[PDB]
Structure 1
Amino acid sequence: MMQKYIVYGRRLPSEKFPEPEVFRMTIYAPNEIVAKSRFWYHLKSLKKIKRTHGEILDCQHIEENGDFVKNFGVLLRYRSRVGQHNMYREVRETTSARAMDKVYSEMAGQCRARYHDIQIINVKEVADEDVRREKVAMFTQKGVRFPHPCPYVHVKRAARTARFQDRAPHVPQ
């Protein structure tokens, strides 16, 4: 559901400063209306330009090619009930937006932090040798094999319409 957007903005031009500077950002958001709001949240803190005093020049939407599985490293900050913290996370996904979906669900589940509690500092691709987290690194290898981690899930699902049967089914492994 996440999407990559590039936003340009600038302070409204005046007599003291004709041709103000242009600032660009990369944003991940579910749509164009949330993305432009998040651009004004940062430009107000980092550059002290409220939304009343500036204008947005573009909301570029960028669609990425998948088809191969890469590593990503996300540097972010979030807020808990006792303060603010920094954190680095690693994930394997096919596009950057999909890697941000995975991050937001792990923050929501293990830290209970929602979307507006989180500021993304950095998102970059990480080559296989340079990985630093054990979970990701296991799969950055040649020849990884494991048996199915939950084959019971197949059997139960079929038993939701086939409510009564004549023998208890097996779980092939």
Structure 2
Amino acid sequence: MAHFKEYQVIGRRLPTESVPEPKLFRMRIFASNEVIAKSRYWYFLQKLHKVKKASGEIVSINQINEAHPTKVKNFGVWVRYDSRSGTHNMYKEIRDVSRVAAVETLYQDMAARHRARFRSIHILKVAEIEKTADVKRQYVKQFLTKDLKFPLPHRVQKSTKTFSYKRPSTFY
């Protein structure tokens, strides 16, 4: 899984004599590949409608590419997750160039700060904030100030050799 990928997954109940041409439900799924995306689709349709993989059918799966992969966006993400003692909703903000890597950042963030495994997370929503001043988290808001520039003090250079003859510097 070099990264996540976003798939649109469209499926339906199996057609019957009573109801030919059912309703065609669709979701956007962040998954490492096609098989997981289809599995996640059925898992989530399990919780919304009376249907399972055996009574249903996957009409379409299509990868969804970022419209502008090279534009930095501020994403607001609503997640539902299970902690060890209950279920909680939260909203986080991630700044990056694509939805898939923003969601990838989000899973890493949920694992790091809340020990929430991919098993225990529901991506309720991902949406770009098209306007500044609608951004609310200070950790992403600090990066939107005009003419932003910071140094990177204490540069640590990687040495290929085991022994150095120079007693190095961390300048930058």
Tell me which amino acid in the other structure corresponds to 2:95.
R
In the alignment, the residues of structure 2 paired with residue 141 and residue 97 of structure 1 have an alpha-carbon distance, to the nearest angstrom, of 25
1:138 aligns with 2:142: yes
RMSD: 1.2
Tell me which amino acid in the other structure corresponds to 1:36.
K
In the alignment, the residues of structure 2 paired with residue 47 and residue 150 of structure 1 have an alpha-carbon distance, to the nearest angstrom, of 56
Find the partner of 2:111 among 108, 113, 118.
Answer: 108
Gaps of 5+ in 2: none
Cα 1:150–1:117 change in 2 (3 A) is farther
1:40 aligns with 2:42: yes
In the alignment, the residues of structure 2 paired with residue 149 and residue 52 of structure 1 have an alpha-carbon distance, to the nearest angstrom, of 58
Q: How far does residue 149 in structure 1 lie from its aligned partner after superposition?
A: 5.1
Tell whether the 8 Å contact from 2:154 to 2:170 is kept in structure 1 after alignment: no
Gaps of 5+ in 1: none
Find the partner of 1:89 among 92, 102, 121.
Answer: 92
Cα 1:149–1:44 change in 2 (3 A) is farther
For residue 80 of structure 1, what is the aligned residue in structure 2? 83
Q: How far does residue 141 in structure 1 lie from its aligned partner after superposition?
A: 2.1
Tell whether the 8 Å contact from 2:8 to 2:27 is kept in structure 1 after alignment: yes
Q: TM-score, normalised by structure 1?
A: 0.93
For residue 64 of structure 2, what is the aligned residue in structure 1? 62
Q: TM-score, normalised by structure 2?
A: 0.93
How many residue pairs are counted as aligned between the two chains? Answer: 168
For residue 23 of structure 1, what is the aligned residue in structure 2? 25
For residue 120 of structure 1, what is the aligned residue in structure 2? 123
Runs of 4+ in 1 over 2 A off after TM superposition: none
Identity of aligned residues (%): 43
